[PDB]
Write a protein that binds this ligand. Structure first.
Ligand code: CA
Length: 223
């Protein structure tokens, strides 16, 4: 997250870190057994880390649970990032508590102009590289479809939305991928892509989670 703030330990209790020997992507806990992340975060051999603040210090509220299964969306296209969503099943259910908690899936799609909370352990620099150890947060508004398509002509599908600031300076970034965009208390987006981070006229692009609720629900009813 570039231009964000330190969230505060365990104030984003649905945020997970996906670990394959190192943090590589975020995700969102949607119930005690399942995480939503980005399909482009797929790796074999994923451990889900819940209850994290500093991902490099065991502070005492973590749960580390291996994935048993990952399910990339059936229509994921890694070239365009259309349908950039994945489900990860935990080997064992998380113990839900004040620090480890699920986020609701949406009923309705979020509205342009809504300010959402985006969070992660990704890079904090637009030019260059610095990865934080503690979780960072950003409030960013959803942009209109027309503005999103202007920013990325021929690239935006109906399964994506933009959020952020066209002046630059505030955005998600590498290593935030797969993490949550929460709007009105529901998971509305997944950190997916963008041109660089926090560059002028190049806002973040997010997987539109409200288009996937029926897939998510049928898949978790079946696995
Ligand atoms: Ca930790």
């Amino acid at each position: 997250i570039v231009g964000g703030y330190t969230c505060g330990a365990n104030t984003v209790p649905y945020q997970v870190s996906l670990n394959s020997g190192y943090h590589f992507c975020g995700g969102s806990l949607i119930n005690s057994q399942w995480v939503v992340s980005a399909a482009h975060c797929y790796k074999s051999g994923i451990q889900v880390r819940l209850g994290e603040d500093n991902i490099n210090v065991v502070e005492g509220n973590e749960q580390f649970i291996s994935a048993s299964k990952s399910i990339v969306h059936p229509s994921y296209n890694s070239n365009t990032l259309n349908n950039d969503i994945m489900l990860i099943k935990l080997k064992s259910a998380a113990s839900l508590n004040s620090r480890v908690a699920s986020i609701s899936l949406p009923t309705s799609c979020a509205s342009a102009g809504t300010q959402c909370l985006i969070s992660g352990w990704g890079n904090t620099k637009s030019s260059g590289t610095s990865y934080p150890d503690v979780l960072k947060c950003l409030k960013a508004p959803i942009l209109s479809d027309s503005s999103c398509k202007s920013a990325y002509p021929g690239q935006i599908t109906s399964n994506m939305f933009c959020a952020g600031y066209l002046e630059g300076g505030k955005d998600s970034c590498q290593g935030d991928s797969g993490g949550p965009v929460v709007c009105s208390g529901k998971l509305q987006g997944i950190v997916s892509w963008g041109s660089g981070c926090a560059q002028k006229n190049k806002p973040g692009v997010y997987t539109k989670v409200c288009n996937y609720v029926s897939w998510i629900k049928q898949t978790i009813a079946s696995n």
